[PDB]
Design a protein around this ligand. Structure first.
Ligand SMILES: [Cl-]
Ligand SMILES: [Cl-]
Length: 162
């Protein structure tokens, strides 16, 4: 198991513009296009990202390309973040994937606000962090996935991903 396979599992793969769980236009492997409700704005953003007239649809390769850039962007965002970096570097590899997951889903921003949990993770208080993490909008709105990530952080193994 690795980050790509993990996220591919959590985000799915769709080749036509779609609405995510929050109702926003997205495409591919969870690639958010825009928060605007204008489909058109979405198509535009799509073409600009891909570099061609897409008409709302892309290929697998295109999707995968966006996914690579996106994983990469997330790691980098973590590294550049002063609140995040230290936590991240203190964790083992599996758990690192779990942090990337969250960041990919909610942004550097959001994760940066999980102050208490962050500290717990840094101190290696797994069970504790896990309970904390569940007291959040994040878990409440997308509980099966959040459960998987949380278990990942809790255990340091890939069992949630079976
Ligand atoms: Cl792009
Ligand atoms: Cl879910």
């Amino acid at each position: 198991m690795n980050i790509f396979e993990m996220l591919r599992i959590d985000e799915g793969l769709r080749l036509k513009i779609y609405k995510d769980t929050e109702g926003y236009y997205t495409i591919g492997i969870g690639h958010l296009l825009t928060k605007s409700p204008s489909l058109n704005a979405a198509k535009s953003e799509l073409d600009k990202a891909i570099g061609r007239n897409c008409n709302g649809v892309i290929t697998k390769d295109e999707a995968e390309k966006l996914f690579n850039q996106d994983v990469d962007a997330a790691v980098r965002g973590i590294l550049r973040n002063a609140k995040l970096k230290p936590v991240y570097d203190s964790l083992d590899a599996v758990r690192r994937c779990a942090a990337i997951n969250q960041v990919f889903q909610m942004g550097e921003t959001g994760v940066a606000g999980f102050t208490n949990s962050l500290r717990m993770l840094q101190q290696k208080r797994w069970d504790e962090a896990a309970v904390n993490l569940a007291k959040s909008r994040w878990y409440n709105q997308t509980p099966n996935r959040a459960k998987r990530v949380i278990t990942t952080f809790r255990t340091g193994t890939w069992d949630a991903y079976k």
